[PDB]
């Protein structure tokens, strides 16, 4: 439209390049180096880190990228879901 | 021997057991008659008393106490640079206050302290004394007395050692004075140590970004004559030599946007090595890291040099770090202002990557608000994760509600006066309100106002006004001139980007108007509007209904909401009617205000103020008169009076008109009444320009802690008012009021205050170039 | 201005003119030593006076008329402006065949005396304050860093430089050494009196006389600005702050201090040592023990000169203008004498049957009865 | 007009605080744990006996 | 100010104008008291009439001044129970304090600093001394500040989901469920953080809310 | 009975040692022909020493200088091969030593010997060093000891 909205920034952002160095296998310790401190997290059951990197232009398409990783109840991953999101609305 | 019990004399300080929680007796064992000396060292050395006595003459241990004394109240004279609110300050940081007990050592420590900083201003014939009278029941009072001798007049500067500069070149710039101007009292030439150590940085910095790097200071004295009245300070330096730079160089851990760093780094070659240049390259590599998140990098740049072939290559190491996030955003200080409405103004989103530029434009935006005094940011990081901050925002909020109340007259009309309020943060809220009404023997008013900034979380603001004017004439309606208007206004607007506001809106009005006086540029709108009145006889009516579609443009990049210190404004508010209304006219006025600093401080500030104004009608239909712009009193020219700048009525010969009461009513009555006579009356054209500068500067008899509430300015001021249309014949024998050449003009100081009333100004102002009818004032006292 | 609330008591001496002095003449070097400390004075050689100011004219006078002889100016010619100020702020010397006059902008200028050439102008580490000393063919110079550097006396030729210390409040006026035995005595700004043995440039004994037990070290400058003397074996100094000493020329050894001290300038006559205090308080001492003869400090806070002791009488300065005249024994206000409202600062000298003072503006005056 | 309700022995605050609503806990539902279990804003079982409002005679006793 | 006499008559007036009421003269004679009477034999009822003084003149600031002077030098006293429940009364009614009453204003999202600088205090009383005769009003001003936090943290998650930004929707509403579970705002809330995980396509997610929603409806 | 002789900085001086001292140190002497003054002003000449000896005292723990047992065992047993109760001629000892050593210790460190006043005084007279040195001890620690006792706090209490 006319109205004039700021841009909006809703999660932590992730470079392929570091996406590519998470795999199957390393503890929680590594993958805290690799990206940081997931900004959401699970608190309900299992211990589930969700990084979502979402941005809004300003009057354009809402652009979202979901990476799931699920940890086993020892400390070590289970596996991944890089989803890039884009789907229904 | 055997001690049976232990008595004590002192009964202040000491508590029941805390006493004995340091002597070994015990009442319970044989003395050695010898560790009672090791008792009394520690009871004394616990630091709760000032003489210890052990006495056993019977058979028991009474130990004579005598506790330090608590002090009581504090004196302290024939200091004059050294103010209470400090020295209050020093007292009580090194642990001496009203109250707790006195220590000697505290005493030799303060007086020391305080010789030190005379010392360091340059009162070297001074001395402290602090003497503590005793006074019954154990206390003391602590007296000071201060020899404050006087400053040493610091004599010359020398900078023995250059050989490509001229000394006063050098010492032009220094913060210490060499030799004051014979004809000025812009400074003074007292010595302070740190604006030594300045000056030494300053000289430092000035040879180092021409060129010269190889560069640095032996050794710097502080001379003294020997009565303590001259100071001469001499400075030693290394001249160098020039040099160039070969190329700069970047290096380490950063990350993945080299393109723009490579690209800031790069510089035109053959320049010369400034050491300016390369914490400006510095400085801009830290915002550019920060606005993609690495909030804390390490940059380090060294100047690898080679002094064989006048080259240095410039190495800057980078280690960007971890992308930041913030965790949450807290707020302090409002304590009124719910929390929306410092959460709206943010441009830094919770639960993102800490843009380091975001923060601080979200501070500029709610300082720009109005109705903060101080906001201060705090970017802070958590005492856990390696990456997460939370950024803290204290403010504290001043009033922002303006009062107005006062009389019409002093006589004694009855139960008749003026109100008025305007809060722009009704509670908090966020919504400004804004009501007043007087109420007079001479006319009747009053208006309210209401606008919400975000009616929706955008910046859509929708606001509403409602008028009542109708004054009829309250000292009579009967033969007078009559006057009953009244309308509603309601409009909205949106931001463009994060410094502009389009506005729109609608509204309609209505005006009736009776037993007007007869003159030319009314007859003139009335002839317009298709009215063919009379002219002695004065029963004419008219009543008007109006539907105008107005809309307005606001720019304001401006520092602060409240008298600022830096940056632009510009209000452009238009008006047109819409078809179907009885007049046919279109208005437009701007107003604009821009403050320029000229100091760092920001306390000197060029103010430059302008107004402009046109309106007509459309369609052959005259503009309506009763929308004639104004000038004069505040808030334009000020210094004549409100509303009395630009045309005056000329009024057709007067007789016979309905009822005349003799002795009043006497505009143009005449029983020998010649014809149209020129009068003082203002009526207001519809073409409009003033302009205002203004030098803002600090108020002199005041302090810093009361500094930011009031200011003081000197304001040169001009503006002019005039009429669009115009009759050669009606207008044979009069000054030419089409004629926009004729400027009223003064100038003079003003004083603002903002009181808990709300905000005052007092000026004193003196007209230069005036005119016919001006009836100019000198005091003007407003709110 | 409201601060102004300085203590002191400067009292006026009982009018008692028990002979007349007269002046001879005067010359008006022009604007001189100013307001700003200095240490110019003219000295005497073969009937001859030389005479210099803070704008660096140098002029050559006679006794007697004050008829000139030649001048010159040292505006800096060899800088961008040759017209600025050269600050001329070392003692005038004049030996043999020429005049060394120092600079605060580190140049030592040896003019030619009668014909008024430069014969050589050179550059000493740091500002040159005191008096240029000449002995066995050499200059010394006492900068005001600590460096005491020697120069050759035909030309320039920086031989040693002795490194002393400086202290971050020390007092103006650097000390201007004493020669004796080959070995040159030499004040420093941190309390110190060191020998230097005058052949190489190697210190021979640094001994400390300055005890500035003061409560506000900050304030307790304690250095030594005046020019030790010696007598025999035994050389004399004075700090600032107090502890007048004798000690021994060949080694470190204090024969005895005196608390008084707190001195600028002071002379002796070989038995009766007189001196000035810091509070303007004209005293004498015995050689022999320290033992106060006699004092006077009917003056305090009148910023005296140095005494000179001409015709029996210690004469001296004031800053209102009066010379006074002390008896030699007991003190006594034997004349006093009003010669220019100018001002002294600076310090008078007299010798070969003589007297010359200069003031603050009107310059050379003679003194005489 | 006038001042509080004898302004003595009675808090300068308003009694409005009594109809705060009582603490109801929320339970766990069908097999999955709350984080609930976390707290630090615990209000540890009081029981009456004592004055509350306006009837609590403050005095230095 | 006061004239010289001996304690008990001053004392006596202190006590005479206290049951009058005029604090601002009796705060005079009190730190006059005070002032000549350091450690005297009753220095501790002088203290606490200077707490009580202070307190009903809306002295704020000097009275928590005073009280945090007291809490010290005398850390246990069969009184010490009454300062700290006047240490917590001094800052909520510090909170609440502004013209919005009149116009009857739900201080809710205002600053929070006051409501935890007094849950402080109330939760040291109840823990401290359980027994005490001051303790039920501490319970019930504890259950309404408690109640207080988790409407202003509402109140921001609230305007969150308003603004779009959703992350900061979720961490909020998760540190309400963690802090201040058993009050009524998080209930209140919980619906925001189902919608904050639907917008952000987390079915996964927002399932287990849900079903949170649908156990407590009662 | 007991009272207080003297305070000092934050230390104190106590009547038991200056009422011990005023006669323990004299009676020795007496038998080589030493005439003491009167026991006023000698004990304002002992009130001297102790005050000093205190500021020292408390001048080693604020530095933090210590003294280990075994230099007291050592120095105890070169006094067996050399010449109140033993505890307490042992805590005399421990303080003496290092008031003894806080003066040598701060000497050597402000004393400057110039290797030139020492071929002097060899051609005047390895003896002339250590008489340079014994000179310059002297003298210095007067200087210091003058200076310490102008920058501490006393009290006379008689």
Known sequence: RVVYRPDINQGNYLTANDVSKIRVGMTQQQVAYALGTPLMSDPFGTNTWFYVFRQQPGHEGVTQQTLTLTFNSSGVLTNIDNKPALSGN | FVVKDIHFEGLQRVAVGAALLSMPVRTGDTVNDEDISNTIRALFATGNFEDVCVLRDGDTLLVQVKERPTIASITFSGNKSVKDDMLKQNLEASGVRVGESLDRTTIADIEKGLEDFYYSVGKYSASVKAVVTPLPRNRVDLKLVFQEGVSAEIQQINIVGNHAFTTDELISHFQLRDEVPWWNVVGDRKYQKQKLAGDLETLRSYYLDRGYARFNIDSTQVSLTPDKKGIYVTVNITEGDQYKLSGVEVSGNLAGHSAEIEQLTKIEPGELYNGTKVTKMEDDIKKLLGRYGYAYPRVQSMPEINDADKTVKLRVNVDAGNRFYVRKIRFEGNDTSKDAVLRREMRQMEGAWLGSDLVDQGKERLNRLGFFETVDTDTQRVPGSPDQVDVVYKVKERNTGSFNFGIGYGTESGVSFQAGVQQDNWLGTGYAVGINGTKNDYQTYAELSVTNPYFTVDGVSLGGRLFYNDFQADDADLSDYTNKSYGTDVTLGFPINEYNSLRAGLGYVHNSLSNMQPQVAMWRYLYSMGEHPSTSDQDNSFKTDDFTFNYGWTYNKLDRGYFPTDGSRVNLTGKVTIPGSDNEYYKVTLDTATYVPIDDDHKWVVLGRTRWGYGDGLGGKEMPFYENFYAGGSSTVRGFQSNTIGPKAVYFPHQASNYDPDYDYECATQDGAKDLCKSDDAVGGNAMAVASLEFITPTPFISDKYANSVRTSFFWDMGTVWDTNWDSSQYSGYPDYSDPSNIRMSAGIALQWMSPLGPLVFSYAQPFKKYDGDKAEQFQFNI | ?????????????????????????????????????????????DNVVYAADRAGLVKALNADDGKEIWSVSLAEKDGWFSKEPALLSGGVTVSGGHVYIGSEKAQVYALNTSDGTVAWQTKVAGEALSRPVVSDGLVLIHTSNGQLQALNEADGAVKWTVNLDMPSLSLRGESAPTTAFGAAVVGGDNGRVSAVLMEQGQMIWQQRISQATGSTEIDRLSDVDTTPVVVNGVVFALAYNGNLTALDLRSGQIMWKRELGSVNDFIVDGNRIYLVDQNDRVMALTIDGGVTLWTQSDLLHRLLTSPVLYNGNLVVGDSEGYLHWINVEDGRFVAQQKVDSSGFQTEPVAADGKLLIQAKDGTVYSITR | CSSDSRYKRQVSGDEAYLEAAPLAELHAPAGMILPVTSGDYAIPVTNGSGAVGKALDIRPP | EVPDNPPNEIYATAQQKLQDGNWRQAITQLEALDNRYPFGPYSQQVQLDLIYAYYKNADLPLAQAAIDRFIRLNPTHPNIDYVMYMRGLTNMALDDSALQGFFGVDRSDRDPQHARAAFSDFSKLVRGYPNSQYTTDATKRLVFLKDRLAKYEYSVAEYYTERGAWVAVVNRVEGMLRDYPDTQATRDALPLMENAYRQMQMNAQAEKVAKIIAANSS | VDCVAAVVNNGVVLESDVDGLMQSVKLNAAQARQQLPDDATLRHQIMERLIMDQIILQMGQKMGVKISDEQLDQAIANIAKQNLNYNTYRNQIRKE??????????????????????????????????????????????????????????????
Request: no cysteine.
């Open chain 6, 97 to 158: 030593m290092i008031i003894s050593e806080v003066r040598n210790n701060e000497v050597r460190r402000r004393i400057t010997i110039l290797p030139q006043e020492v071929e002097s005084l060899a051609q005047q007279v390895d003896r002339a060093y250590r008489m340079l040195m014994n000179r310059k001890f002297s003298e210095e620690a007067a200087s210091w000891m003058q200076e310490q006792r102008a920058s501490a706090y006393v009290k006379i209490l008689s």
């Open chain 3, 1 to 45: 201005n409201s601060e102004e609330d300085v203590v002191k008591m400067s009292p006026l001496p009982t009018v008692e003119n028990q002979f007349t002095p007269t002046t001879a003449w005067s010359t008006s070097v022009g604007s001189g030593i100013g307001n700003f400390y200095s240490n110019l004075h003219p000295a005497l050689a």
